[PDB]
Amino acid sequence: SKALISIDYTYDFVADDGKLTAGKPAQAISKAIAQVTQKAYDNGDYIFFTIDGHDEGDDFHPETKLFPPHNIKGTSGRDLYGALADFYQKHENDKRVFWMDKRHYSAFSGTDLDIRLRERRVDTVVLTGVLTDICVLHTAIDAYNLGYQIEVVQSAVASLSQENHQFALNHLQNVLGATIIE
Amino acid sequence: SKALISIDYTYDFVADDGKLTAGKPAQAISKAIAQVTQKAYDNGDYIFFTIDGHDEGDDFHPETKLFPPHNIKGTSGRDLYGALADFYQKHENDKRVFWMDKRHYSAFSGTDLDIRLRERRVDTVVLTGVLTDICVLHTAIDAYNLGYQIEVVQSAVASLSQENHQFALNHLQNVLGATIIE
Amino acid sequence: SKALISIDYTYDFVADDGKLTAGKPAQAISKAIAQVTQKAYDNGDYIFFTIDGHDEGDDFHPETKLFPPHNIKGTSGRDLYGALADFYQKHENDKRVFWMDKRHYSAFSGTDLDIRLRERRVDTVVLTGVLTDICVLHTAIDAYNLGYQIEVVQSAVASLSQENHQFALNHLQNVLGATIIE
Amino acid sequence: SKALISIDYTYDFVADDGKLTAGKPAQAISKAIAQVTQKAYDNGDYIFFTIDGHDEGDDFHPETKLFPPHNIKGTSGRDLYGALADFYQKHENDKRVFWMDKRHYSAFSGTDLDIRLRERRVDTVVLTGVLTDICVLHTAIDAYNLGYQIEVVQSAVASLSQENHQFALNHLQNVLGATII
Ligand SMILES: [Zn+2]
Ligand SMILES: [Zn+2]
Ligand SMILES: [Zn+2]
Ligand SMILES: [Zn+2]
């Protein structure tokens, strides 16, 4: 059917003292992203938490030259932010809810996301999380190239700047043919 | 060695009468993209022309909902614009120069670009062509996910608007770690 | 949606004078492979001819060291063998019939086969052609990893090595879970 | 730059009591596979343990119709067999030693193996583990399609029969251009 992808909504990307935080704009979607995730689950959708994870002793990651350390495996920075954490805790062992560690921006890159979606004959991915113009955008581009229909929940994605958030939404709708949802 | 990728610099994307033309901004790079391509070749680089091609009777293409017909196989719209066309004519049988038809925005999607690059142990791709924020950007994202170093020649890429061009260059540099060459 | 994959059933792989011919065992399937292809087409299936296309000099292709030149681009060696040639000629412009050049053994590698199948929401591939233990096997393994259901038409696949043919059929059924249609 | 791939050498695939065991033929390479892994690591190679792992009750897995439950995550069935287990324990935290869960036969499918190899500019993979004609073979075919040179250590891979072991070795050498070591 459909799969909701919950991209990088962690303490380090959202919290005031997060190591790579997008801050207020990211915090602003905390209630919405939790609500839409529960709704998707209620609707029978599959839910995939696709979460940046960096190993401590890893000097071969391109990001190391680009950003300070963040989302370190084994640390609290990788905790989900807001009520979304309660959803995951409550449904940790549900067959329809998945946690996938990732190391690139796209949720598809180096993961088994496409495999799990194909097993379930999912034709549509619904994207939520941060940042609209980076991990959301890269995930959508890979989804497009893999032939998925794409929906993006506008009230449940966010970027550092409104300008970049807007560029990303326009690209998603007008280049990738995604449906932007409330 | 390096490979220069020449992305979609065709009549339909560049020329005044092109079916999906980016117009003056695309035309403005015509001399530079030809020069940089010849230089790369003189310097020992492989050259890959990666060009949008639509089969006439193809209603399963995702772009059908978005754009009017363009770059139709067998038509003059797929002709290379400017002096670039003479470079290709002269090297049509050169084992170091390639023409690859593509159907998605990224030059890697559904093509054998990665295979040809890996055969040659290419570690760096040099991106040129149009549009900076779409086919160039998608190609760069795939390249990043595939572990290539990325250079982008600022004078030999163009977008529909300066704003989009700038979003893309910033993303290439700050998100993908690409070297912007001026 | 179903798709029938017609793998390398060409003069060089089948004919008495073919450059890498499997010989009588491959010729033995000529009527069957034509009939099953026509039937699949009559049933509404998509038909994909996935055909080795090589360059003589190519020291960058690992395969060049392993086998004599075969299926060279521009040569009669790439002609389809038997009545399959008439089928292709008659449907050369049919939206449901495709010709795809390939350079590796698998029909998926470096091609846009997965993309075309996903556009059509194909869930099952029907494999025919040669050789059972090389191109058919590699194509099947890729199809399995990409989440396709797989059928193999026993009367329409062949190898030179009958030992290897049986190994392949056993592997297809017992490892990949393919349906061997007999 | 070389990487040794250690494919599926677990209790469930190897031990007498393993849930999907290949039994004696797999047990036979226990000393050789541990030894060669240690040597590769000594030569400066990267070491990747690529290990079948099934989520409990996962009915969407294609193997569900093919094989009995095996290599269940969180169970002792996924323990490495023989001295190889001591290697992993001792080198768990070593930057050059990796553990990757996989669900298809190939070590590349749905994993980040290609990404990690590319980061390190590895051009050659050295294949060990079981079974020669299934997980080893599929990994090799993926490696070939991804442009890697391939070596296969004959004394540290094994199949259910010599016939299949030999089919796979011949395929690796003659079809994929692998070097048999
Ligand atoms: Zn990160
Ligand atoms: Zn187009
Ligand atoms: Zn061939
Ligand atoms: Zn298994």
Residue numbers in the entry:
A (entry chain C), B (entry chain B), C (entry chain A): 2 to 183
D (entry chain D): 2 to 182
Verbatim from the authors:
Both datasets were collected on SR facilities at the wavelength of 1.000 Å, the high-energy end from the K absorption edge of As (∼ 1.04 Å), and sufficient anomalous signals for SAD phasing were obtained.
SmPncA consists of 183 residues with only one cysteine, Cys136, serving as the potential target for cacodylate modification. Since there was a classical zinc-finger fold structure found in the final model, we identified the other four anomalous scatterers as zinc atoms and further confirmed the existence of zinc atoms in the protein by Inductively Coupled Plasma Atomic Emission Spectrometry ICP-AES (data not shown). The occupancy of As is about 80%, whereas that of Zn is only 40%. However, the peak heights of As are almost twice as those of Zn in the resolution range shown, indicating the phasing power of As was dominating during structure determination. By contrast, zinc atom alone could not provide enough anomalous phasing power to generate a reasonable density map for further model building. Besides, the phase error plot clearly shows that the arsenic scatterers made the major contribution to SAD phasing in this case. In SmPncA, the stark difference in anomalous contributions between As and Zn in phasing power is mainly due to the difference in heavy-atom incorporation manners, although the f'' of As and Zn are slightly different (at 1.000 Å wavelength, f'' (As) is 3.7e and f'' (Zn) is 2.7e). In the case of SmPncA, there is no reducing agent involved in the protein preparation or crystallization. Cysteines were in contact with dimethylarsinoyl, an As (V) group. Here we propose a plausible three-stage cysteine modification mechanism for SmPncA without DTT, involving the Cys136 as a nucleophile to attack at arsenic in the cacodylate, and Asp9 as general acid to donate a proton.
